[PDB]
């Protein structure tokens, strides 16, 4: 973080959605088709995981942005899946909608008036009006279509009026009101809707029975054959169709069933899949649950791990190469299928070849996303779900908590000669921990000395940042160059593009600085206070006063403490006025003191304040 | 996310209201110590009057609105002293519910009001009983929790940190961390030791109560059998 580098734009909100295949194909830097990663000699193979279009790799420049390994941010690519695959994360959902739909009229087996009732209630809940969603159930007139369509009209009329009335006042915005209780009422309904959807056996719209769909641990669906009672039901309800004009099921068949159902039931699914009103007016398509392509992350996030001398292959590239082998194989199977056919009859083999092709690519797709959904291989390679939940997870281990710069660790030693609000910093830490101090007229004298002193003499400086943005290390330089740079600190900027800026001096931690002292476990905020730095010569341990022993719950039995050195004035002010030790005399638990003298001082006081003491 | 809002209420990260006021009085615990130490405050009147400098505040606050209302609530409270909680008057609600504690001198918790008034009655003692009342009213004003204070983290830390001291075993009912887990962590409908505390009348004697205990206690056939002989 640089104060000389302000940011004018900010992220106000994050929107969660699904990438469409058409979207990925356009943004893609290169189509990945090759399972090999390197050509002979050592250059990356064209159409492979290490292609230079995905970013700079092996001292070569990127073939998309032209930049080297440092400045190139990396570029996304794509794998064209020869057949669509079920997205592992959304399989359970597409399964719910597959079991809930009629295979004939291609509507949900639940009665349209009942479905509309859920769509109405869910539309009113997009806006913060729960009372109205319940008041809809009060609207009431084997039932004729002319009567039921009037009920759907009266319900839609109340929904349109209740929204407009609340919209007129400050009850709900055009973007819709959303609270936890509103969310609770939505979650209850979306659950009840799916429960009613799955419960119906015989379709309420057209009285024909649909064949039940069963599932296994891995992403694969089967179709259980209908019983003779339900087969005869299809026959007797076969004439009414004319007047209007266990076996494995392929991914394409499921997608084609859901395609029509998501079109015919678009009205309810519009509110089932949107928490707040859909202002983007996007269509809720079934192909969101399916993967026709796979995005290839940039080479930057798939670099081979180097441990000493050995350069180990990246586990993601390994899983991606497997998807590429299967894709080339199905392209050949489809090519042989295209060749031949007049001769058929025994079509049990062509479907058997198809089932294998589909289940193999699906497994390779699953293995890449979530490994605990892929078949056992004679410990498997972790999927992207496993990467986000390795142990505590990416969110807990690298977002909520992080390893930090400008910080030190050491065994604490007691000291009654330092202030109760101070910390005894060893000169070892003082010569390494630096603060970016901008050079001005009021501190030119103080920083000139620090620059002359250099990185090994305290109070010195390890580096100097010019107004152009560049850094000048004082580490290798002798007293002569340092003296010259010090007389060049307050020189006016020739460049008009940086006249606003002034040079910075990365000066050693002085006795006026704030530091965050931490003793783990940090059970309460008093275990992380702000201390005043006191550099003590010829020291190899952090010196701490006895008054701090209580708050940190630290005993000098070989305990360790973390020292954090915040790098800006706003963070300084906070560690000196909010998290500082003196402002932590009383704990918020009971409002009682956690600061005081501990042993010798108590025995000394009883003797010093005694009548006999003159 | 739970913190103190600029409208003194305890609001979650998403703006949803959790509490209308911190502990019902908006006092910072790290300040609520000498706030009842009236004799201390009296002995250090001029020292604290110089601390809580009112000269730079008298133009920014109200000195009567809340003080008048405080009397009206005290009036109806004394009227229904012997009366039960369900039959109590609901005409005038607390002074803190109607007047901002940082803007109106006198919008103090009824607990503080009762305690302060009781001190001035039980202790007749150059400080007047009226000018001391103002100083304590001002002390409460300066003891308010700051808007922005993360009362959420502070609360969990105030329950967590001292619950480390109760890791040791029993020396019937569930105690320590297992009981705290039954509440906070699992909100169990099936508690290990479910109990009921029944307050007995005065007209029911110690013998009658013990006979009543026997009348409700579960009796098994095993408990009345001495011997079983099978021939």
């Amino acid at each position: 973080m640089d104060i000389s580098k302000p940011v004018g734009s900010e992220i106000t909100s994050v929107d969660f959605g699904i990438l469409t295949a058409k979207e990925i194909r356009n943004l893609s830097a290169k189509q990945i088709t090759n399972p090999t990663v390197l050509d002979n000699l050592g250059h990356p193979v064209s159409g492979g995981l290490y292609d230079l279009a995905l970013g700079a790799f092996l001292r070569n420049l990127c073939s998309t942005c032209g930049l080297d390994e440092k400045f190139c941010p990396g570029h996304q690519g794509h794998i064209e899946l020869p057949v669509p695959c079920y997205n592992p994360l959304f399989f359970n959902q597409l399964y719910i909608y597959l079991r809930a739909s009629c295979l004939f009229c291609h509507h949900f087996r639940l009665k349209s008036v009942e479905v509309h009732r859920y769509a109405c209630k869910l539309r009113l809940l997009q806006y913060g009006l729960i009372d109205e969603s319940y008041k809809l159930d009060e609207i009431t007139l084997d039932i004729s279509s002319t009567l039921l369509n009037e009920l759907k009209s009266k319900r839609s009329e109340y929904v349109d009026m209740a929204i407009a009335k609340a919209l007129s006042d400050g009850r709900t915005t055009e973007r819709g009101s959303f609270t936890a209780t509103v969310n609770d009422e939505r979650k209850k309904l979306v659950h009840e809707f799916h429960k009613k959807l799955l419960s119906r056996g015989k379709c309420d719209n057209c009285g024909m029975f649909s064949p039940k769909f069963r599932k296994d641990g891995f992403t694969k669906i089967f179709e259980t054959a209908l019983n003779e009672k339900q087969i005869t039901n299809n026959r007797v309800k076969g004439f009414i169709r004319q007047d209007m004009i266990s076996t494995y099921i392929l991914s394409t068949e499921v997608k084609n069933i859901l395609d029509t159902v998501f079109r015919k039931e678009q009205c309810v699914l519009q509110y089932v899949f949107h928490s707040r009103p859909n202002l983007s007016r996007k269509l809720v398509k079934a192909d969101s649950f399916f993967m026709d392509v796979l995005v290839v992350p940039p080479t930057r996030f798939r670099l081979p791990s180097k441990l000493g001398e050995e350069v180990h292959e990246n586990s993601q590239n390994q899983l991606l190469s497997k998807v590429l082998t299967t894709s080339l194989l199905i392209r050949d199977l489809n090519d042989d299928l295209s060749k031949l056919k007049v001769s058929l009859e025994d079509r049990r083999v062509i479907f058997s070849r198809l089932m294998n092709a589909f289940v193999t690519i699906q497994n390779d797709v699953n293995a890449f996303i979530d490994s605990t959904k892929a078949q056992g291989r004679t410990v498997p390679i972790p999927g992207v779900k496993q990467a986000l939940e390795k142990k505590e997870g990416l969110f807990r281990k690298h977002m909520m908590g992080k390893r930090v710069n400008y910080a030190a660790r050491s065994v604490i030693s007691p000291d009654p000669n330092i202030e109760t609000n101070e910390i005894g910093v060893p000169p070892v830490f003082a010569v390494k921990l630096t603060y970016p101090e901008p050079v001005t007229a009021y501190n030119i004298a103080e920083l000139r000395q620090a620059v002359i002193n250099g990185p090994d003499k305290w109070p010195g400086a390890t580096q100097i940042q010019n107004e152009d943005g560049s850094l000048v290390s004082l580490i290798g330089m002798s007293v002569e160059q340092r003296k010259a740079l010090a007389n060049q600190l307050l020189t006016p900027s020739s460049n008009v593009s940086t006249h606003t800026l002034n040079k910075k001096v990365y000066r050693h931690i002085k006795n006026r600085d704030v530091v965050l002292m931490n003793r783990q476990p940090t059970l309460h905020k008093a275990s992380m206070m702000g201390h005043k730095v006191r550099v003590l010569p010829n020291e190899k341990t952090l010196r701490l006063h006895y008054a701090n022993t209580g708050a940190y719950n630290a005993d000098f039995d070989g305990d360790e403490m973390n020292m954090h050195f915040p790098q800006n004035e706003n963070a300084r002010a906070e560690a000196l006025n909010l998290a500082n030790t003196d402002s932590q005399y009383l704990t918020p638990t009971s409002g009682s003191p956690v600061r005081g003298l501990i042993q010798d001082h108590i025995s000394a006081g009883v003797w010093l304040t005694s009548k006999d003491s003159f | 996310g739970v913190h103190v809002s600029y409208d003194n209420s305890i609001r979650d990260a998403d703006g949803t209201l959790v509490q209308f006021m911190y502990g019902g009085d908006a006092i910072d615990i790290t300040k609520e110590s000498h706030m009842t130490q009236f004799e201390f405050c009296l002995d250090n009147y001029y020292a604290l009057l110089k601390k809580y400098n009112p000269s730079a505040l008298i133009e920014h606050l109200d000195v009567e609105s809340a003080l008048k209302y405080s009397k009206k609530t005290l009036k109806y409270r004394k009227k229904h002293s012997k009366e039960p909680h369900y039959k109590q008057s609901v005409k005038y609600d607390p002074v803190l519910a109607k007047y901002n504690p940082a803007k109106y001198l006198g919008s103090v918790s009824e607990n503080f009001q009762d305690k302060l008034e009781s001190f001035l009655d039980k202790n007749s003692k150059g400080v007047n009983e009226k000018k001391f009342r103002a100083l304590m009213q001002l002390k409460y004003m300066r003891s308010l929790i700051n808007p922005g204070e993360a009362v959420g983290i502070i609360a969990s830390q105030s329950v967590g940190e001292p619950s480390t001291q109760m890791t040791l075993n029993t020396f019937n009912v569930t105690l320590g961390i297992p009981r705290l887990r039954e509440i906070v962590m699992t909100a169990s409908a099936a508690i290990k030791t479910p109990q009921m505390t029944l307050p007995i009348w005065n007209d029911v004697s110690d013998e009658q109560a013990d006979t009543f205990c026997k009348s409700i206690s579960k009796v098994l056939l095993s408990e009345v059998i001495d011997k079983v002989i099978v021939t």
Binding site: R396, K397, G401, Q520, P521 | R181, M185
Partner: peptide, 28 residues
């Protein structure tokens, strides 16, 4: 055992692998 805790910079708040994990072994 305390020497290993003396050097390790804790990821979070201990671990529920004890009785807490067997209490979480109850589905709604």
């Amino acid at each position: 055992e305390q020497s290993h805790k003396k050097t390790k910079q804790a990821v979070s708040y201990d671990e529920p692998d004890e009785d807490e994990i067997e209490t979480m072994r109850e589905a709604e």
